[model samples]
Target chain A: GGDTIFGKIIRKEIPAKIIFEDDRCLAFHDISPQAPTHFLVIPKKHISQISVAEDDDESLLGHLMIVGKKCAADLGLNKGYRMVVNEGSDGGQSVYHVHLHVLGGRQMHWPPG
Target chain B: RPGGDTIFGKIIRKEIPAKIIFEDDRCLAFHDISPQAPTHFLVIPKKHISQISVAEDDDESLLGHLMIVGKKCAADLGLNKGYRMVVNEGSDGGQSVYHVHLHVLGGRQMHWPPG
Candidate 1:
């Protein structure tokens, strides 16, 4: 459990329905979709056992954003969406592995706390 | 873009040394001096823009590039589990710099409020 569950997902050891895939990134429906457009954006590398990444990982970082945009458009969330990746104990992240959650479809509030 | 005499200014002017992770014509990324998470990276536009409100007029491509880099770094860093990116605006928003910066944080179970 200390290790990344996402690594397992990327390795095919875990069962995840991938909605999108590339050499460096993969987007898929969240096991538990919180919104009409709920998905997970992930990377294929192993930067850390924890949720953080290294400073030098530049190209990998860019790829994730590109894919996130693709997934959002795929879900027709181009109108709007909430892209959140809660970091650390203060940001409401249940998992320690690094991932971005793209949530949308419902009318959102002004200040998302 | 944000507020205050930022730590980044020192890094930018070579007044301080940071573990710079990325850089191009527009921005520079470096590891956080005090990392709350394993991968605490900061993406800052090299432009002299002061805040997010001001960044709008600065360089749109640089701003987007920052996020794009964040996502790519997430993968390189293996944030496939989960990660978060943030732009602190002002003091009310917990902004510590006069120069705008994007907080790309991950490697831990993030909680609520972050207050």
Candidate 2:
């Protein structure tokens, strides 16, 4: 229906553990959470990936980060958190949409595997 | 005194040497001193944003520019195999530098528990 299943989440065609959503972006739990606290923030507007986002989309990209920060705070990730954006295969990106990952609530190891 | 107080700021002005791979009017990209991956680099705004928690509305454009520049930097490195970008915040986020820098890591099988 949309570019990726995330679009479906935006359109309410799929079920997701939605943490927050506004006119610009949406935050939902990751089905495959890498940590005790793992979720994703994606723009309701579909941009295939960060690499392909147009210059005009700058504000939107920034908005997503801000939103992710807000979501993290609202969700009680006060201990600290990590934001990640994966691209391509080796990068381990499964979805095509641009999404920012928020992970926390555990001792985040280094070498960031 | 501004961002100039940070190590990244000095690198920005060439006071410190780094493996600078990319640079432009608004941003700079360089290899991480002890890279966690073969293709690892970082992108930061020449403007000296302290951290994500402190970034204000005025930083929107500059912040967006940094993300795009990070993606561009990755592409330029030919890391078509894939890579992940990370931004750590606060003590819990493991933010070492007061200056905000986006990390682009790849050229290996990226695992989970993303540090």
Candidate 3:
């Protein structure tokens, strides 16, 4: 929708691993990874966060969920994986664009920070 | 409801008791026994998905339904403070329970790294 770094990545202005892509979204390796198999899946559209999504966005939102597991399997995280969405200030979100973090390939610690 | 062997499956089948909050054809919601925030609960699909990495193709609609329900629970529960959704998969994500469930926590500031 509007401009954000994630939008740039979508536009190909910023290059990322682009591990997976479909009509609905894109998956790329995180610049700052938290786990051995770590990456992010972002919507092609620039919704700020999941909190802003309404009923109309259900299919697209669900598409993101479907892809999260797909990306993990593609990344060799077959043993396990974790998914997270950080929203608003309290969620410790650094990037406002809506994306889900898929981290695994190792054990994840608690408090999620 | 799957009523599969997992704890959540048991929850869905009513073999175990949870302080139930929400439910529908595809998923169920309940308060976390150990609440992580002022308002904390989990939403899980009736489907017996082990975790994210192991999800199957037909599980798509239900998976999204679980996520969509996460937000519904947040707003319906009145988590005006904002919230976070976390899915722990397997050992690293601490798939302690085995069955997939979405943890929605808020009503206080959520911290980073989400460990």
Candidate 4:
């Protein structure tokens, strides 16, 4: 209905290395990974971004985190991991659809720019 | 009580000054003094949990609540386009504050390969 690559992936219109899937969300390996263990976790709904998320979106948003945590543990990110959700143009959100980046398997630097 | 009365805890008790966005018994949201983005803010738990690594299984709901409030605050900031939520774990993760806080950044286009 809108212009979102994640929507296409959810509808099977695009191919993605999916890591986890449930009725509410999808977790997949990031095509352009920034870390050894990097993945994208997104909700199936067409949420433009976190800025627009309403009180109604709470449970779904929380689910994404739980799933993200599971993905990190399953992938053996026992040492630690980082979770990032970039929004708007300045925050570094290239994709419009809200998604979380699960990055690990290496020591992450600070000043997360 | 590893790091008691961390800056964020003081904010909860009004012991310090912060541009609070939202507050409740469990957490508080506020603007970052040094914003990296146009709408840079932080969501913190009132409890003095050091960081994410120490978050116990029983704290799962509390952690999720923080995320929910973070997103809500982004909307309150009118970031209808999008925003970023970052939880830096340790010194390596760019965490200057020992207390766990979710960084909600938005109000512009976010970049990739974030530090």
Worst 10 residues of 3 chain A by lDDT: A54-63
User: What shift in Å separates residue B75 of candidate 3 from its native position after superposition?
Assistant: 1.3
lDDT string for model 3 (B81-110, tens) is 678889998877777887888898887887
Error of 4 at A21 (Å): 2.0
* Cα error of candidate 2 at position B51, Å: 1.5
For candidate 4, what's the TM-score of chain A, rounded to 2 decimals?
A: 0.96
- Two-chain complex of model 4, DockQ on C-alpha atoms against the true structure: 0.43
> How far does residue A103 in candidate 1 sit from its true spot (Å)?
1.2
Kindly indicate the candidate among 2 and 4 with the higher TM-score: 2
Candidate 3 local lDDT, A1-113, one digit each (tens): 44888988898887898898888799999998866777888889888877777667776766787798887877787677778887676667778898888888887876555
DockQ of each: 0.11, 0.71, 0.66, 0.43
State the lDDT of candidate 4 residue by residue for A1-113, as single tens digits: 24788888998798999999999899999999998999988999888877667667776776777788788878887777778987676667778888888888778875566
Candidate 3's C-alpha runs over 4 A off are none
Q: For candidate 3, give the lDDT of residue A31.
A: 90
**Chain B TM, every candidate:** 0.84, 0.93, 0.92, 0.94
What are the runs in model 4 whose C-alpha is more than 4 Å off?
A1-3, B1-6, B53-64, B75-82, B106-109
Cα error of candidate 4 at position B78, Å: 5.8
The global Cα lDDT (0 to 1) of model 4 is 0.79
Q: Report the Cα RMSD per candidate.
A: 8.8, 1.6, 1.9, 3.2
- Cα displacement (angstroms), candidate 1, residue A77, comes to 1.3
Give the alpha carbon lDDT tens digit for every residue of B1-115 in model 2: 5445789989998888999878888889899998999988999888878888778877877778888888878888888788889998877788888898899999998976677
The number of the candidate with the highest DockQ is 2
C-alpha lDDT values of all predictions? 0.64, 0.85, 0.80, 0.79
